[PDB]
């Protein structure tokens, strides 16, 4: 049975969106020549098809961001008085001094990470920071009630008592250890702050991949593909149209193949980005707006609560978990035999320190006398395997006598 | 001269021997912002990535030059997305504004009170 | 688009095989036939690739729908915002062309009220905690109620359990706890 606990805070990084790029098919293949355009018009709707695929990919990113970050009806503000029971939320709460209202940890996260056009996102960084601040203020002030309707206020210590109940530990354990829990939370947050300033590789991998794909696409414009030269102006200046067409056709074929490869791999990347964004939205719904019973979904340990922070093209979750510590050996029995009848524990386990028998809760050592109030009777002592002999106390009799 | 992508970035004049940089002429897409055909027949035109001077009410955004829409300094819910926090709506002419995330609420937090 | 791509030259002199055969001798004709073949093969391959990419998304959506059928219709889910918005009660499926429709029934609370609250009650040098619920006060009296609905009740030894003294807990308030056994005894 554990005799002590630890408060653990850990981070998780998930990509959400990627860069929105567009390529004009005619400009890349031909540039500004009319002969090449007239020759390219005989190939059908390849250019219209390629442009529509890229437009769909670009449109999907805004939906990706909206599904993850726009999950609150209202923009909640934190109260001016920060009386949260000893818990300190300052590295994750906004500071007005910075021109952007990004928090300290958000600043640390943001400091780390031919027919071509790059399109700006619909939502700016300030709007995403405001979304995260509203989510975090709602979580601090109203618990999980604002997810399912209107925000109902509650003191923070009582919310933590509810969250301790949610993992099988009683409320008096929280209420008789409040200062230690607050200190442990503060120290863990400080350790995250130190570790970050001293990580985000998943967010940089996407940027590297996209940049490398664009570089390959641009560099493929200097290949001859069998023509006398890779420059179209030289071909048009040095040759008559009937002899120029046979070279321009080879150039067109090569450049079409290059654009089609690029678009296909871009679609395949966009699918994975969408899956990651869906996972991030599920985590936002289930870890931040509630308390999850799923094992290893929100952190490592027994989940208590999570806090979201915005990252460039991503999101960071800080998971707070409960970790038992300092276990101790005991001897246990399934039941107790008293007056020829068998007693079972209501919501605990029978333990022995070597001479006496007690009943305690499963996740924390807190022995108590075995009475009829915390046990129930079923049958007799013959059936059970491993029953032991002991006395069960009846509180009513001494009071009556 | 050549850039990273091996294009003729710079040239030397033969007659006077001076180095002149070569930069491409402006290009970009054209987007049309329209209400329903029943509602009205007037439109706004956005030149993406193009400075307003290069174009042959004029309002400059991070997305590009917007022609035909008047900027109002109020905020509403987004109707038609333009980009970089700007939306457009028909209210009669087309207006452009900065979108609002939602209503502002302050919870009555205290260390004694519950709802 | 696939059907319409059959009227393109792809560099040849005509898009009709019969016209090419009639207007040209075989040795020159095969050169145009090869161009047409290459173009049409490329069109077919593009169609097949996009069909595969779309089928992957359809499969992901179908997997999500199957999970929702298992967890919202055949049970009650505690996952937040998975089966509707609110506290999930039950769901009913309907069939749609190439799809499925879920009708989610949820529970939404309303009409909240101010109250004063305390973590514990101090009585006879003992600290009492609520077994299941929260201590509330209307201004003069103290009750215990369940968390998601207001139903005040008298604080007794049957709603609370004792753990320790009154010195440790921050915010403990003095009040009385009624013992039901004593009136029956006397
Ligand atoms: C449970 O663990 C905590 C943290 O290790 C213990 O609190 C520390 O105890 C040591 C030893 O007395 C003190 O020097 C520290 O000042 C305490 N606080 C911290 C933050 O380290 C606590 O004593 C343990 N519980 C029991 C019953 O031993
Ligand atoms: C096991 O628990 C029992 C019960 O608390 C312990 O017995 C107590 O020992 C202390 C001194 O250590 C005495 O002051 C108490 O009067 C004892 N209680 C009773 C009911 O006799 C016992 O010491 C613990 N350890 C072992 C090895 O038995
Ligand atoms: C808080 O609730 C208590 C319990 O209902 C109220 O006390 C009762 O008030 C009514 C109103 O006149 C009286 O008829 C009862 O006799 C009172 N009961 C007792 C046991 O005294 C109390 O008035 C409420 N307080 C406020 C401020 O509304
Ligand atoms: C929270 O911690 C910071 C140090 O990171 C400290 O400056 C601040 O005073 C603490 N909050 C309160 C309310 O003391
Ligand atoms: C419990 O017993 C095992 C086996 O005798 C021993 O290895 C261990 O050190 C004991 N103590 C704890 C805290 O597990
Ligand atoms: C545990 O196993 C041992 C055999 O090594 C046996 O003697 C003992 O009775 C068993 N315990 C119970 C409670 O039956
Ligand atoms: C428990 O008590 C009963 C009744 O006195 C007795 O028959 C039984 O043998 C006892 N158990 C053991 C293990 O001695
Ligand atoms: C002729 O070209 C030379 C460069 O070799 C230049 O220095 C000179 O000024 C030019 N003369 C005229 C008349 O343009
Ligand atoms: C155009 O808008 C009007 C609104 O008065 C609406 O009644 C009408 O149905 C719309 N047009 C079409 C084709 O639906
Ligand atoms: C357009 O040109 C003016 C004049 O140089 C400049 O001040 C402005 O920043 C340009 N527009 C953008 C979007 O950079
Ligand atoms: C924009 O803000 C300025 C601030 O001085 C104000 O005068 C102006 O009226 C605002 N724009 C509109 C369309 O009202
Ligand atoms: C609780 O009291 C505050 C005090 O200002 C009030 O604003 C709030 O509306 C109250 N909550 C209710 C009535 O649900
Ligand atoms: C609430 O805060 C006030 C002011 O610091 C304090 O006097 C009171 O004891 C606190 N109550 C609780 C339950 O923490
Ligand atoms: C509760 O009563 C005790 C003695 O009965 C007293 O010392 C203490 O101050 C009281 N608490 C309050 C908050 O008045």
Residue numbers in the entry:
A (entry chain A): 714 to 826, 856 to 940, 944 to 1146
B (entry chain C): 566 to 621, 641 to 675, 690 to 713
C (entry chain C): 961 to 1146
Task: Tell me what the authors wrote about this structure, in their words.
The SARS-CoV-2 spike glycoprotein is the major surface antigen of the virus. Its function is to bind the host receptor ACE2 and mediate the subsequent membrane fusion required for cell entry. Here we have examined the structures and receptor-binding properties of spikes of the B.1.1.7 variant first described in Kent, United Kingdom (now termed Alpha)10,16–19 and the B.1.351 variant first described in South Africa (now termed Beta). Recently emerging variants of SARS-CoV-2 have acquired other substitutions in the spike including a number located at the monomer-monomer interfaces, at the receptor-binding site, and near the furin-cleavage site.
Similarly, we also show that the Y453F substitution in the RBD of mink spike, a structure of which we also report here, only increases affinity for human ACE2 if residue 614 is a glycine but not if it is an aspartic acid.
